[PDB]
Amino acid sequence: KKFALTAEQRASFEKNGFIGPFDAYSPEEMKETWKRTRLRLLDRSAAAYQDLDATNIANYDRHLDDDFLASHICRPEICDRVESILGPNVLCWRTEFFPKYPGDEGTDWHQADTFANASGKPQIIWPENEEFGGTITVWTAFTDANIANGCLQFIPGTQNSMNYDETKRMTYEPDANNSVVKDGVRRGFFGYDYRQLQIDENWKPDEASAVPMQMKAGQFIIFWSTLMHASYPHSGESQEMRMGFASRYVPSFVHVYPDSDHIEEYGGRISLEKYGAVQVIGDETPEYNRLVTHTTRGKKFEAV
Numbered sequence: 001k002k003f004a005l006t007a008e009q010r011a012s013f014e015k016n017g018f019i020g021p022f023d024a025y026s027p028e029e030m031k032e033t034w035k036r037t038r039l040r041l042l043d044r045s046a047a048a049y050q051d052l053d054a055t056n057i058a059n060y061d062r063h064l065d066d067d068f069l070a071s072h073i074c075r076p077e078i079c080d081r082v083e084s085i086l087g088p089n090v091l092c093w094r095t096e097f098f099p100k101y102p103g104d105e106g107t108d109w110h111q112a113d114t115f116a117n118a119s120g121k122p123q124i125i126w127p128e129n130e131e132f133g134g135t136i137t138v139w140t141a142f143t144d145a146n147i148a149n150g151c152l153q154f155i156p157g158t159q160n161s162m163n164y165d166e167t168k169r170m171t172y173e174p175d176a177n178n179s180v181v182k183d184g185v186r187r188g189f190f191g192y193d194y195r196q197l198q199i200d201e202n203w204k205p206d207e208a209s210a211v212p213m214q215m216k217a218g219q220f221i222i223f224w225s226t227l228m229h230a231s232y233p234h235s236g237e238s239q240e241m242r243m244g245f246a247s248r249y250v251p252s253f254v255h256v257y258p259d260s261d262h263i264e265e266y267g268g269r270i271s272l273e274k275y276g277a278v279q280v281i282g283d284e285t286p287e288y289n290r291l292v293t294h295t296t297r298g299k300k301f302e303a304v
């Protein structure tokens with residue numbers, strides 16, 4: 001397809017666990033789009049999750065209500081590259097906004113396979129006979145992302161070995177988890193401390209090997225959720241906030257929210273009544289995955 005990964009790009013992705021950044025929009029187009037979208041998003045009247053029983057869950061699945069985000073997850077610039085990795089039938093099962101306000105703590109080092117990390121209950125389950133896990137995350141810079149405003153960082157080549165155990169639980173305590181200094185860096189996990197999930201209490205991330213991923217507004221980066229990733233803190237030197245938008249993809253055979261009609265995490269609880277996965281690539285998915293074809297405002301999931 002037109003934006004497929006090259007063979008060299010595919011080799012690099014396999015080695016490093018991330019590939020890009022690539023362009024979805026020009027910086028000028030992204031700036032204007034984000035200006036309008038940020039305002040529109042303040043209206044939650046069509047959101048799939050009405051009652052939040054609050055939470056970071058307020059950032060989830062706005063593609064299910066928003067015209068632009070419904071187009072974005074389907075962008076061929078994104079989907080052709082996801083297809084190179086995930087094959088002919090692929091769902092977007094989750095989206096999340098990741099703001100860093102001026103002064104915010106960096107995102108903790110983490111890896112996720114099942115996404116039971118915060119809730120204690122798996123959200124995606126791959127075939128049990130196989131060795132695959134996690135989700136392909138496409139993280140789009142809705143603003144510029146630089147080290148000073150909290151850009152992402154990765155430890156290359158760590159996507160094939162988990163350092164955390166998502167059957168351990170971590171406690172939600174925002175109070176306590178605010179700019180906790182960890183190996184010289186203010187970091188947290190949206191009210192949790194991801195170190196609580198470490199397989200070995202005394203192990204530490206190989207932060208000396210971390211590399212930054214600075215991006216311009218309109219770019220995206222592709223990485224496995226099993227890759228060691230984090231963000232820098234936002235120093236507040238800029239008075240402009242950083243915004244990333246994550247779209248998460250799995251092959252359609254992966255079980256999405258098995259045995260669940262609600263999720264409880266990040267200090268909130270939501271119903272999955274108006275949730276569905278979106279088929280962004282191909283036209284076959286097993287019956288066990290609930291799909292939607294349109295937003296809650298009747299906009300088709302297709303790139304415009």
Ligand SMILES: CCCCCCCCCC(=O)OC[C@H]1O[C@@](CO)(O[C@H]2O[C@@H](OC)[C@@H](O)[C@H](O)[C@@H]2O)[C@@H](O)[C@@H]1O
Binds near residue numbers: 160
């Ligand atoms: C018709 C075409 C359909 C294609 C379906 C999609 C298959 C994706 C395969 C994959 O590379 O998965 C890699 C994921 O699994 C992980 C889990 O640790 O890798 C495991 O898979 C192997 O890749 C072949 C091994 O190299 C690793 O040891 C690893 O444990 C991480 O690289 C990623 O999270």
Ligand SMILES: O=C(O)CCC(=O)C(=O)O
Binds near residue numbers: 098231246
């Ligand atoms: O944007 C951030 O600070 C973290 C992003 C992230 O962890 C993800 O996309 O999985």
Ligand SMILES: [Br-]
Binds near residue numbers: 155205
């Ligand atoms: Br590591």
Ligand SMILES: [Br-]
Binds near residue numbers: 225
């Ligand atoms: Br993750």
Ligand SMILES: [Fe+2]
Binds near residue numbers: 110229
């Ligand atoms: Fe993450």
